[PDB]
Amino acid sequence: PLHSIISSTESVQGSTSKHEFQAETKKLLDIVARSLYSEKEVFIRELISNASDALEKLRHKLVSDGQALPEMEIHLQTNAEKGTITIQDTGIGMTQEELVSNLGTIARSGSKAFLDALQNQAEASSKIIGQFGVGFYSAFMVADRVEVYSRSAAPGSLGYQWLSDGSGVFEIAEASGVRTGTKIIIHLKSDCKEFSSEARVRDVVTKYSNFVSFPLYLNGRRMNTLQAIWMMDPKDVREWQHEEFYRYVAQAHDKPRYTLHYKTDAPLNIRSIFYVPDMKPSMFDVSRELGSSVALYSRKVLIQTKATDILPKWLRFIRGVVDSEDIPLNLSRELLQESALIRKLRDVLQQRLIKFFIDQSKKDAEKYAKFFEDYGLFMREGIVTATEQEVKEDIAKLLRYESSALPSGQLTSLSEYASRMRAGTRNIYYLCAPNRHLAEHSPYYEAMKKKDTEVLFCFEQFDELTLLHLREFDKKKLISVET
Amino acid sequence: PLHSIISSTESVQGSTSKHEFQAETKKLLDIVARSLYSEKEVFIRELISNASDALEKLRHKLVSDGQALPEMEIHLQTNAEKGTITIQDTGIGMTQEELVSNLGTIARSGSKAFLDALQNQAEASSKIIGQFGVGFYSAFMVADRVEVYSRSAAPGSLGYQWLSDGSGVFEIAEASGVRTGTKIIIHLKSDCKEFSSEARVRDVVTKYSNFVSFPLYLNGRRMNTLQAIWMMDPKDVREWQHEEFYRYVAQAHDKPRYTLHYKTDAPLNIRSIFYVPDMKPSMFDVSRELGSSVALYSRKVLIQTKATDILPKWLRFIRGVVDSEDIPLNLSRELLQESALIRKLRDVLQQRLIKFFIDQSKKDAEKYAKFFEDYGLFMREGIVTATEQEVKEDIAKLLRYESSALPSGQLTSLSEYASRMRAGTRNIYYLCAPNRHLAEHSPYYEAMKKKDTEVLFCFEQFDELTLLHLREFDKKKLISVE
Ligand SMILES: Nc1ncnc2c1ncn2[C@@H]1O[C@H](COP(=O)(O)OP(=O)(O)NP(=O)(O)O)[C@@H](O)[C@H]1O
Ligand SMILES: Nc1ncnc2c1ncn2[C@@H]1O[C@H](COP(=O)(O)OP(=O)(O)NP(=O)(O)O)[C@@H](O)[C@H]1O
Ligand SMILES: [Mg+2]
Ligand SMILES: [Mg+2]
């Protein structure tokens, strides 16, 4: 019994009137403090990003004008006694009009406006982090009061103080002496006093801002120490560098047995590094039912420490970093947005890694065999779980087997088997047994021996199950010899 | 090496001027359409919650005035030819000022102003979904134009038309006829044509809004036939409904082997149903097994289909729903605002489900043993990966073993071995073997059984690894016979 009330009754009768959308500013601020970020700590990531942007703008001006660069630095000070955290930078600072407009207008982004004015023809075009114009207001998560001192690098500019508790009102007054650049003093809330602890702030800086491009000093001590090697030309990164960075991003004590440094500007911008550990995972690690973990960055800022969306699940044995400007960030900057173009990135990363391994098998075959023994279970899992047959056959190119036509211990591919089939032979034949002795004593294989047919010999755990799910390769049916 | 440029040099010489924050209004609307939600279909969830809130206000107004309710309904129509989706509700509607204000001011929430006026003293205090005042703007994700017809239920109210292309201006004009209620007409973009298809919209509705409290119709068809039984008092929900709801929320064709209907207030208000499937996990390594969780709801709106945060990973085999009316939501309403509030909830649920399974072992021990065989791997994993010893020992209360002091096949807990420990004894002794025959003829057992001591026989995959990570139970150390 279909029931509907919807029909076109409505006839606009009258004169119209036009209005502008308004906003409730005090509430928008509270949305930022309460309902936006998953963690209170990211206010440090937001303020450091602003400090980086302010220095990047100053560097752009001075290099364009032929002036010498001064100290370009970001400083953090925790005072536990006073219950404060303080960030100060030596960048462009702000005039009084800039404090009013850029701090006082929600979603107003001076750095986005700077970007648009370049025609993105300069070097800072890809180094500038801010877009949304809300990031500063993250401080009202942890702050009772926020106290800003700023002095613009422009001629004749004095210092100003900017003061707000987040009420929808701020105060501005002239101030001295203020160093060129910006100093933000955060008076922490009752439950937020942990951000006046040096140890705590240190961890927050290291987690989010570790790769920032200007020297960062916490309570007098330099920090970064870590170059973002995914941004560099691959030919410029030593093995020592890849080893130390792998130990960092993977929290591991071993070495990478494989390193793929993948940079592409099309279709998407990708700065990525992927590592395969030396150590072989245990069956417990494998069955622990995890997803992919790869740290995700944009413009050197951490997005997520382990992003599960960027690599397929069968490639969770891989450790590394992926950086992109292209893919747009969620307003909270803790995740990505458009799901189809994420999946475009994942398909590209999947194809690029399968090509990497196919190439490692041709480059060094005995090394690849050891990698297949240690990681081949993941490829078997990936073939079993995949849905599109094209994925199954791509992953299946990595598999290796013995052969009745090769000596004991010699590994072959499905491709190499296909190359060796006779003129009209339509099928890839296989036998799954614990070892080559038991395979060759199979009564079902002895029948094959009367003919000229090659038989694949599969000794690995879940080989047969994998071949039943893969079911064909290169349009040739995979047929157990035991049927 | 001590270098810092921060010292307090600053003094205020000058006069203070006071200012109000402003906002860039068209960009704020752009942020909502682009940078907020992970999927664009969510505009349908947002419009249905607004329809539901309008109906809940009309219901509250009328009941407190002693009035009979008129028909309370939510309708959607897709038109593929015209490229539109339309939602209409018979609820409270909007005067002209309410149109200018509630649709025209970003973050202005009439529903939240309502809830505020009710101060948690009314039925509607727990049923009103809207807080933020942005959710209606989610339609500019998918729309070229949004034309709105509303007529307030205030007697002798005129109808009006609110029209916007989302560009930062909108238009208002009088209209007749407008049924008391609100009708929203969305003119979809080229890429969004999509939601002009009934099949697609039908999928979105059942995903998010399937439990909305008022009758919902899509092209005349009745959408929500399924009651939200986690809200019902537990003893009112019979086995037929659990079986059917289990199949819905788990996407499963079997029956639950166990069912726990759980309500409490601490740390939050929980209304939850937990199921263990009759089938047994296909072990194996992973396939879809990132997945297969409890769904998270708030005020009968889906937050997350697989709620990752609210149960420990080792409890991921559980299916069901957890609904909380007070749970802090992310602005996107796809996530939770992290707190001790979620982590306390996760521990309250872990404690509650461990208590559940202990109790099931005491009611039917034969049924519990089969659950232990099928689902034991999950508790071994949670014991290995747990950080805190007491969580390890809590989960370990669920483990069973055979024993040298019991007939072959009979199980035992660690507690029951502990309670047979003699006066002058010390540790819990265990032997892992493939079966009881090997455990009894083990060389290390013969050198043992001469003594008076009891030894567990552990035949399950990863029993050894599990006991090595536990290391201790009830402050008695776990010692292999090697
Ligand atoms: N340390 C600083 N020095 C100079 N200008 C700053 C500083 N911090 C913020 N500003 C200015 O104030 C504006 C507001 O900052 P913020 O609210 O973080 O927005 P945003 O950085 O532009 N965009 P996003 O960070 O993506 O939200 C910035 O665009 C800058 O123009
Ligand atoms: N169908 C409707 N009928 C009557 N009033 C409505 C309707 N839709 C929206 N409104 C009013 O317009 C306001 C804005 O809606 P919306 O932008 O969804 O904000 P919200 O629902 O208050 N909060 P949230 O949904 O949490 O962003 C609501 O609070 C209502 O007062
Ligand atoms: Mg910023
Ligand atoms: Mg709403």
Curated annotation (Swiss-Prot), chain A:
Q: What are the BP-aspect GO terms?
A: chaperone-mediated protein folding; negative regulation of cellular respiration; negative regulation of intrinsic apoptotic signaling pathway in response to hydrogen peroxide; negative regulation of reactive oxygen species biosynthetic process; protein folding; translational attenuation
**Keyword set for this entry?**
Acetylation, ATP-binding, Chaperone, Membrane, Mitochondrion, Mitochondrion inner membrane, Nucleotide-binding, Phosphoprotein, Transit peptide
**Compartmental location:** Mitochondrion; Mitochondrion inner membrane; Mitochondrion matrix
GO molecular function terms noted in the UniProt entry: ATP binding; ATP hydrolysis activity; ATP-dependent protein folding chaperone; protein kinase binding; RNA binding; tumor necrosis factor receptor binding; unfolded protein binding
- Where in this protein does the record say N6-acetyllysine is found? 193, 255, 263, 355, 362, 397
Extract the signal peptide range: none
Where is this protein chiefly located?
mitochondrion
What is the role of this chain? Chaperone that expresses an ATPase activity. Involved in maintaining mitochondrial function and polarization, downstream of PINK1 and mitochondrial complex I. Is a negative regulator of mitochondrial respiration able to modulate the balance between oxidative phosphorylation and aerobic glycolysis. The impact of TRAP1 on mitochondrial respiration is probably mediated by modulation of mitochondrial SRC and inhibition of SDHA.
Tell me which family the UniProt entry assigns to this protein.
Answer: Belongs to the heat shock protein 90 family.
> Could you tell me what this protein is called?
Heat shock protein 75 kDa, mitochondrial
Q: Which organism is it from?
A: Homo sapiens (Human)
Q: What is the lineage of its organism?
A: Eukaryota, Metazoa, Chordata, Craniata, Vertebrata
Range within the parent protein: 70 to 552 of 704
Curated annotation (Swiss-Prot), chain B:
User: GO: which molecular function terms?
Assistant: ATP binding; ATP hydrolysis activity; ATP-dependent protein folding chaperone; protein kinase binding; RNA binding; tumor necrosis factor receptor binding; unfolded protein binding
A GO-annotated cellular component:
membrane
Q: In which tissues is it expressed?
A: Found in skeletal muscle, liver, heart, brain, kidney, pancreas, lung, placenta and bladder. Expression is highly reduced in bladder cancer and renal cell carcinoma specimens compared to healthy tissues, but it is increased in other type of tumors.
Q: Give the Phosphoserine positions (modified residues).
A: 101, 125
Q: What does this protein do?
A: Chaperone that expresses an ATPase activity. Involved in maintaining mitochondrial function and polarization, downstream of PINK1 and mitochondrial complex I. Is a negative regulator of mitochondrial respiration able to modulate the balance between oxidative phosphorylation and aerobic glycolysis. The impact of TRAP1 on mitochondrial respiration is probably mediated by modulation of mitochondrial SRC and inhibition of SDHA.
What is the protein's given name? Heat shock protein 75 kDa, mitochondrial
Which residues belong to the signal peptide in this entry? none
Q: Which residues carry this modification: N6-acetyllysine?
A: 193, 255, 263, 355, 362, 397
Instruction: Please give the subunit comment from the record.
Output: Binds to the intracellular domain of tumor necrosis factor type 1 receptor. Binds to RB1. Interacts with SRC. Interacts with SDHA.
Indicate where this protein is primarily found. Answer: mitochondrion
Q: Which residues bind ATP?
A: 50, 89, 102, 136, 333
> Which start and end residues of the full protein are shown?
70 to 551 of 704
List of residues that carry Phosphothreonine: 105, 425
* UniProt keywords, alphabetically: Acetylation, ATP-binding, Chaperone, Membrane, Mitochondrion, Mitochondrion inner membrane, Nucleotide-binding, Phosphoprotein, Transit peptide
What subcellular locations does the record give?
A: Mitochondrion; Mitochondrion inner membrane; Mitochondrion matrix
Question: Among its keywords, does the record have Membrane?
Answer: yes
GO BP, sorted A to Z: chaperone-mediated protein folding; negative regulation of cellular respiration; negative regulation of intrinsic apoptotic signaling pathway in response to hydrogen peroxide; negative regulation of reactive oxygen species biosynthetic process; protein folding; translational attenuation
Source domain of life: Eukaryota
Family listed: Belongs to the heat shock protein 90 family.
